[PDB]
Amino acid sequence: PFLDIQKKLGISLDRHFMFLSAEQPYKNAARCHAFEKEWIECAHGIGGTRAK
Amino acid sequence: MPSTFFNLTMAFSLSLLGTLMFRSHLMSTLLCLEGMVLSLFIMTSVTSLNSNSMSSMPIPITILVFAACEAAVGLALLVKVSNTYGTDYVQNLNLLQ
Amino acid sequence: QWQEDPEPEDENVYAKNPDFHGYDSDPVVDVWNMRAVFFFGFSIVLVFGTTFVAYVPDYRMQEWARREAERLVKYREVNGLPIMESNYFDPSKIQLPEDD
Amino acid sequence: MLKIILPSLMLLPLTWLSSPKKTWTNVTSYSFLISLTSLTLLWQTDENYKNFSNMFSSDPLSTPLIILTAWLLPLMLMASQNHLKKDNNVLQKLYISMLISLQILLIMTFSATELIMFYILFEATLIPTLIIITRWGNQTERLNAGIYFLFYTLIGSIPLLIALILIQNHVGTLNLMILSFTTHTLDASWSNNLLWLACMMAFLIKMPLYGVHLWLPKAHVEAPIAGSMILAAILLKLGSYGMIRISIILDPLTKYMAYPFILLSLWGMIMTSSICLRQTDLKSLIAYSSVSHMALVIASIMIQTPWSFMGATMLMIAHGLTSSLLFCLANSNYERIHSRTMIMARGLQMVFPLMATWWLMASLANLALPPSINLMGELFITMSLFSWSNFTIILMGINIIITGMYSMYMIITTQRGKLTNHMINLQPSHTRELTLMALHMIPLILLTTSPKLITGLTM
Amino acid sequence: LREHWVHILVPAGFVFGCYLDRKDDEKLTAFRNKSMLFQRELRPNEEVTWK
Amino acid sequence: KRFFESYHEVPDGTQCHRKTYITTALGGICGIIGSAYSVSLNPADSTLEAVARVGRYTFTAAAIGAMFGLTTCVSAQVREKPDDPLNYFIGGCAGGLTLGARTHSYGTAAMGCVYMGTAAALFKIGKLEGWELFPTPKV
Amino acid sequence: MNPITLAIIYFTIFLGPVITMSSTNLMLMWVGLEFSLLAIIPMLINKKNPRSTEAATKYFVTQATASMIILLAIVLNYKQLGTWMFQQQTNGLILNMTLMALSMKLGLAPFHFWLPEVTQGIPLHMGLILLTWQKIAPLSILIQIYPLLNSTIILMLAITSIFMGAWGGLNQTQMRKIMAYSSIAHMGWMLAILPYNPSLTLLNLMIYIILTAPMFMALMLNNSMTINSISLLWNKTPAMLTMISLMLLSLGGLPPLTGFLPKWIIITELMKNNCLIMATLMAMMALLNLFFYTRLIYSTSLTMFPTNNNSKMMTHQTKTKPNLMFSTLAIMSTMTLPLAPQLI
Amino acid sequence: GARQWQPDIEWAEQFSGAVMYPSKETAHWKPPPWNDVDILKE
Amino acid sequence: FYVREPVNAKPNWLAVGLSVGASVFMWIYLIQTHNEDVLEYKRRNGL
Amino acid sequence: ARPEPNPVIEGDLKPAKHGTRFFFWTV
Amino acid sequence: DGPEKNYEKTLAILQIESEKAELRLKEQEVRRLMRARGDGPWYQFPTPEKEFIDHSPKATPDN
Amino acid sequence: MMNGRPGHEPLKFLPDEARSLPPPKLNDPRLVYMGLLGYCTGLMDNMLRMRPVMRAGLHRQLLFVTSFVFAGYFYLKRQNYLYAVKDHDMFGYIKLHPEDFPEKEKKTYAEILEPFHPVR
Ligand SMILES: CCCCCCCCCCCCCCCCCC(=O)OC[C@H](COP(=O)(O)OCCN)OC(=O)CCCCCCCCCCCCCCCCC
């Protein structure tokens, strides 16, 4: 984000749980785990202006 | 849910109109302020629950923990005011004009 | 009433220092503040400057053009060419909009 | 052109580091020589303008001024050695430095290739000037005068800032050289008709036009002599220099977008000239004389005929020198008299024989006596104005008759008539006062011998 | 250089100034002699037309 | 909203009725908003007093709206020149005058006329030159 | 303050903005905002004067409701996209809420009423923190979401702020409130260019911080909350009169000083993006800000106001010095303009 | 013999008062206590 | 002298040595960086 | 099928052309 | 030194200023294109980490 | 803007790629300015603290002139890189998307006919 002290430090205290397809406890996939994946592996390397 | 999610949202707006239209006592406001936190807590919990998104349940509570202290600060200011004026009316808070 | 100073009079610097030159109250600074101002002012700016400015050569080419005219007028007249032809950029070079 | 500038900057270290007693002579003596280095720019043995380097250039229009800007710093520092000799030794070194920065900034502004370099330096000159006027201003009203001088220039300035950033996007560089050799032809839209006004208005404000000139009478009235010299000699001409270099672009619109100003200026020339006729404050009369003789200039930088332009260049340099001379002698009367009133102090020639000769020559420069660059200038603007419309002679003809009347009235009611009975006795003239004058007129005599140097870009 | 260190301030500026103005030339030296009006061919034992 | 926009669609000077109606509404809308801020802050003494102020501001604003619309449309009609900042200026000129009257001040009418008219004229130019306000980032 | 408490609070007031900036999960951005709210309130009432309790109780209610509105935006997003963070798809109303809310915490435009009043009842010191280390947090959240916010609203809040700030300042004579008003104005420019070139927002902020931090440590060196009080600066400490003069004219946009660059490049970027309507009006009333800046200049420097006899007593005693930061932040601020290209 | 006019007490007076350009009612406003502490109590 | 002595009469000799010594560490790192830099630049590019 | 990644500008850095192209800062 | 030096110096000054001008304008066009196109390294706005998805055997069929 | 670029170093000051660029000459006018900017800070400090302006803190004066300058070389070193990235990025695009930035032919004035408005 504004100051990426997280990527730099390599820590991931805030990224592991931002989307519904993130690791859910006891591997209980949420609804849509299928889609969101398909909608974020698509928009990866393609910026937003072209993820839209 | 889509239907209900509306009621909760308007509850938050009715609580919004409340905190943005004071009347005498402040403790009323702070109380109203809390009505929003309940509505936010209920809505966050509801969608997390019907999205089966268990990774996010931490939030519904973090919201309450921060909101409680927030309110603690709010009430200490309130007690401070009815110690300096003793009537807690938003009415006398005008020295700064 | 509030406290403030009584109007300060302006001294007749010409009462002491009867040779006052107008630059400073104590006499030696005055003398050395005109001996250097008339000098650097008049003696080596109005004189050396005007000397140099007078000797700038053919300023903005107007000493060159009164000869180039003379050889052009010499050349154009003797060879019978018009002294100042009426189009400068040759008509052949121009590619006038053809239709209009 | 960093000798006319770097050695200048170094003046600041000298005003500060030098002894309190010797601070004045080190600064004045050195800038006299700084003017001598400035004279080197006059060596143009060819038409090509002299592009010293990317940011710094000097063409015929700037060169005649850079030398004047360098020349007046010595004089300004010599005219303010009296007042400002009652200060604490750190107020002086501030005033001396303020005067030094004005020509450093003004030398660069007149010698700047990028138009926005002009803007940044252009509007910076207000900081040094406002301090000179407000901090050392004698009258109660200088706080007001300072406000007028800052706002009229500032409100004009931000439109120019938007306009110049606008042309950079439209053309792609604000470099005066390129902008000239590139095709920037406005298209007579309603918008362009605004662009033109945006660019010219900021320049038209500090060049007092009839509509916005109230700032100059108020500013010079309470301004100290050095500030009044700077405003009349170099500061107002910043507006003219800007109009010459900015109208290279906006070429088509001024053909028809100028009428408003031209008429404002020529009628303005008459009324400003006339109110000089009955104004009790001498500094007031010289200031309106400055407005009228500068109203002629905005009416030649807009007709845009070769002769106008160099009529303008001739008059601007000439009137600059003459006005200061008038403002400088006005101060000498003010310091002994202690009042700006013209009616008091009558008969001075009887008691100050020479200053009166300087007064007479300054007035003859003020009105158009013929073997003077001042007349050549007006004669030329007059000619072109006549070409624009033969009727113009009527209005530029009422101004000449009025200009003769107020110029001589300043001599007749200040330097002739019976002596004032017993004002505080008027101490004799210092040699500084007289030189400060001689330094103004000896150059006016020398320039009149060879007018070619101050003729402008056009010729 | 004593008590005269305030007289050699301005003069020194000049020298530094001249040092830069002759250095600016060194930078803007393309078209050294490649200009059309003045493109003479190098005279024998002369390094460059204008320095 | 398709409404207000209509003002622009039909050529100026034509269908003044619509123009005046639209202009009157905008002024009135501004009146309400303006009165609202004027009542929320600097409150009144009695509800009625404030209802009055709302009315006063609303009408005054509606008036400036009308005369602007009417004058500009008619000026164009009578003058027959549809595209001319001057039409609008006359209109803005008038609008200011109404404001001046409602405020019972000749002086206000002065500043009002000049400032208001100039602004309106600029609107015309803006539309004529396709000036863009609040533009999307296109860098 | 038991020095331990001082540490906990100060850490929170500092962990508050830092969590906001570092995190991407909006939630964690919200609690960063929440901490800042909790940490600032204790310091605000340190004197515990009757004015102070009023200040904090206002600051807190204004801050709290805005915090709740920001949370609602995050809660709504969570249902329009499972993500806990704004995305291209975000409903426009969702983002506008965040703008209004965040424009309340930052106090821009029609929500500019709380700031002038809290700046008036808090000490000069806590005034600085309330003005400059509490603007970093919300702005971070906006700068991150810039691609998605509305160009129209921002501009309206931008222009409004500029006007409100300027107009408000003209009348004010209390310094704390003159600064509060200036901050509203500068904050306006900052939010004007956010939709177009966020990187310039971060310049128009730093420069504001490098300008305001010296200006306030100047106001408190003599702890003068009145212009009349700052006007006798010439007797209490004469040297700061020179730089106080330039810093205030620098705060306004006058060209030689560093303060021009933020306005100049913001105008260049807006014209590059074609807002030559908006940019022009902003620059014009920006000129109103300098009028009240120069009116203060007049009182403090260009003219010497009369002083009381006891001022001679305060001169005698050695004046506790101004920290070094004043100098380093006065010069880097009054004159860096010659180095603009590298700043941007 | 000259005293650039330094401001007198009266020029200074205007800058006092809680608002520079006082309004008819805002004129009643009184400068806030220098100590930042008020007298009210009961 | 002074009834109330200055706190600064005899120099804080630490403040000299961390002020002087710090600056001489700055240069020796700065000048080092430049020549080192120049080299990296030369080898990384043609010369 | 997924969309392609934005292309990659390639090469090595060379001192910027003509320097910071700011306002008359010949840099 | 001569007429040669200023003529050749002025042409060098113009080439630098002409080339700077062409580039400044091209920047504005490139920057217009990448913002809307989003097909260039500038204006590449972020979308969530693919690295944080979980394509691991879930606890239910059909993920 | 330039953030989001491929390879972006998430928190680094000046990526090693900036090694390829020439180092800033220590006497670069700018670094020399920073020096003077610094000396002045020092002098100013002395003044605000009421010390002999130039003859005091001759150790500090050095810290200042040498802190500012140190900062410069390493800042300019970066800002220089940032600008250099901008070209790499800009020039590349002009090519990768050539059609959008097409070379244009400018007709010799002989051909073009700009209208002539007479001044008269
Ligand atoms: C781009 C140009 C921008 C403008 C430059 C010129 C204006 C500089 C800013 C001036 C602003 C303040 C104006 C009013 C100042 C009043 C000062 C005063 O009242 O005197 C007291 C003051 C402190 O006194 P003290 O030094 O303690 O000892 C004397 C005790 N009576 O005495 C002092 O403060 C002494 C130190 C004053 C500061 C010295 C500054 C000298 C002038 C700097 C010019 C810089 C020019 C740069 C040109 C760049 C060109 C590219």
CSV table of N, CA and C and ligand atoms in Angstrom, one decimal, chain D residues 9 12 16 88 90-91 94 97-98 101 104-105 108 121 124 127-128 131 135, chain G residues 238-239 241-242 245-246 256 301-302, chain L residues 47, ligand 1:
chain,number,residue,atom,x,y,z
D,9,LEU,N,25.9,38.8,-7.2
D,9,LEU,CA,25.5,38.1,-6.0
D,9,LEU,C,26.5,38.4,-5.0
D,12,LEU,N,26.3,40.8,-2.2
D,12,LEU,CA,25.6,40.6,-1.0
D,12,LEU,C,26.6,40.1,0.1
D,16,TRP,N,27.4,42.5,3.8
D,16,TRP,CA,27.3,41.9,5.1
D,16,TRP,C,28.6,41.8,5.8
D,88,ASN,N,20.4,51.3,12.3
D,88,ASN,CA,21.2,50.6,13.3
D,88,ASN,C,22.4,49.7,12.8
D,90,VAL,N,22.4,47.3,10.8
D,90,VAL,CA,21.9,46.0,10.3
D,90,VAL,C,20.7,46.3,9.6
D,91,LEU,N,20.2,47.5,9.6
D,91,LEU,CA,19.0,47.8,8.8
D,91,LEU,C,19.6,48.3,7.5
D,94,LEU,N,20.7,45.6,5.4
D,94,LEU,CA,19.5,44.9,4.8
D,94,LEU,C,19.1,45.7,3.5
D,97,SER,N,21.4,45.3,0.6
D,97,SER,CA,21.2,43.9,0.0
D,97,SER,C,19.9,43.9,-0.8
D,98,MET,N,18.9,44.5,-0.2
D,98,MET,CA,17.5,44.5,-0.9
D,98,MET,C,17.8,45.1,-2.3
D,101,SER,N,19.7,42.7,-4.6
D,101,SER,CA,18.9,41.6,-5.1
D,101,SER,C,17.9,42.1,-6.3
D,104,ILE,N,19.9,42.0,-9.4
D,104,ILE,CA,20.3,40.6,-9.6
D,104,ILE,C,19.0,40.0,-10.3
D,105,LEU,N,17.9,40.1,-9.6
D,105,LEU,CA,16.6,39.5,-10.1
D,105,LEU,C,16.3,40.2,-11.4
D,108,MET,N,18.4,39.3,-14.4
D,108,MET,CA,18.1,38.0,-14.9
D,108,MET,C,16.7,38.0,-15.7
D,121,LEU,N,10.9,35.1,-11.8
D,121,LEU,CA,11.8,36.2,-11.4
D,121,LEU,C,10.9,37.5,-11.5
D,124,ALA,N,8.9,37.9,-8.4
D,124,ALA,CA,9.8,37.8,-7.2
D,124,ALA,C,10.2,39.3,-6.9
D,127,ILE,N,8.9,41.1,-4.0
D,127,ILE,CA,9.3,40.8,-2.6
D,127,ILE,C,10.3,41.9,-2.2
D,128,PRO,N,11.4,42.1,-2.9
D,128,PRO,CA,12.4,43.1,-2.5
D,128,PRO,C,11.7,44.5,-2.5
D,131,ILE,N,9.3,45.2,0.5
D,131,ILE,CA,10.1,45.4,1.7
D,131,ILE,C,10.6,46.9,1.7
D,135,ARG,N,8.8,48.6,4.7
D,135,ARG,CA,9.6,48.7,5.9
D,135,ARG,C,10.2,50.1,6.1
G,238,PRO,N,14.3,39.0,18.0
G,238,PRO,CA,14.3,39.7,16.7
G,238,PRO,C,14.6,38.8,15.4
G,239,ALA,N,15.5,37.8,15.6
G,239,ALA,CA,16.0,37.0,14.4
G,239,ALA,C,14.8,36.3,13.7
G,241,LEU,N,12.1,37.1,13.1
G,241,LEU,CA,11.2,38.0,12.3
G,241,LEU,C,11.5,37.8,10.9
G,242,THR,N,12.7,37.7,10.5
G,242,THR,CA,13.1,37.5,9.0
G,242,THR,C,12.5,36.2,8.4
G,245,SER,N,8.7,35.9,8.3
G,245,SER,CA,8.2,36.6,7.2
G,245,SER,C,8.2,35.8,5.9
G,246,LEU,N,9.3,35.2,5.6
G,246,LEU,CA,9.4,34.3,4.3
G,246,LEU,C,8.5,33.0,4.4
G,256,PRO,N,9.3,33.3,-5.8
G,256,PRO,CA,10.7,32.9,-5.5
G,256,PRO,C,10.8,31.7,-4.5
G,301,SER,N,6.4,42.0,11.2
G,301,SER,CA,7.7,42.4,10.7
G,301,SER,C,7.7,43.9,10.1
G,302,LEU,N,7.1,44.0,8.9
G,302,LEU,CA,7.2,45.3,8.1
G,302,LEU,C,6.8,46.5,9.0
L,47,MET,N,22.0,32.5,14.4
L,47,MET,CA,21.3,33.8,14.6
L,47,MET,C,20.1,33.7,15.5
M,1,LIG,C1,14.5,36.1,-4.5
M,1,LIG,C2,14.6,37.3,-3.6
M,1,LIG,C3,13.6,37.1,-2.4
M,1,LIG,C4,13.7,38.3,-1.5
M,1,LIG,C5,15.1,38.5,-1.0
M,1,LIG,C6,15.2,39.8,-0.2
M,1,LIG,C7,14.3,39.8,1.0
M,1,LIG,C8,14.8,38.9,2.1
M,1,LIG,C9,13.7,38.6,3.1
M,1,LIG,C10,13.5,39.8,4.0
M,1,LIG,C11,12.2,39.6,4.9
M,1,LIG,C12,12.2,40.5,6.1
M,1,LIG,C13,12.0,41.9,5.8
M,1,LIG,C14,12.0,42.7,7.1
M,1,LIG,C15,13.2,42.3,8.0
M,1,LIG,C16,13.3,43.1,9.3
M,1,LIG,C17,14.7,42.8,9.9
M,1,LIG,C18,14.8,43.7,11.2
M,1,LIG,O1,13.9,44.3,11.6
M,1,LIG,O2,16.1,43.7,11.9
M,1,LIG,C19,16.3,42.9,13.0
M,1,LIG,C20,16.8,41.5,12.4
M,1,LIG,C21,17.3,40.6,13.5
M,1,LIG,O3,18.3,41.4,14.2
M,1,LIG,P1,19.7,40.6,14.7
M,1,LIG,O4,20.3,40.1,13.4
M,1,LIG,O5,19.4,39.8,15.9
M,1,LIG,O6,20.6,41.9,15.1
M,1,LIG,C22,20.0,43.2,15.0
M,1,LIG,C23,19.2,43.5,16.2
M,1,LIG,N1,18.4,44.8,15.9
M,1,LIG,O7,17.9,41.8,11.5
M,1,LIG,C24,18.0,40.7,10.5
M,1,LIG,O8,17.0,39.9,10.4
M,1,LIG,C25,19.3,40.5,9.8
M,1,LIG,C26,19.2,39.4,8.8
M,1,LIG,C27,18.1,39.6,7.7
M,1,LIG,C28,18.1,38.6,6.6
M,1,LIG,C29,19.2,38.9,5.6
M,1,LIG,C30,18.7,38.7,4.2
M,1,LIG,C31,19.5,39.6,3.2
M,1,LIG,C32,18.7,39.6,1.9
M,1,LIG,C33,18.6,38.3,1.2
M,1,LIG,C34,18.5,38.5,-0.3
M,1,LIG,C35,18.5,37.2,-1.1
M,1,LIG,C36,18.6,37.5,-2.6
M,1,LIG,C37,18.5,36.2,-3.4
M,1,LIG,C38,18.5,36.5,-4.9
M,1,LIG,C39,18.3,35.2,-5.6
M,1,LIG,C40,18.4,35.4,-7.1
M,1,LIG,C41,18.3,34.1,-7.9
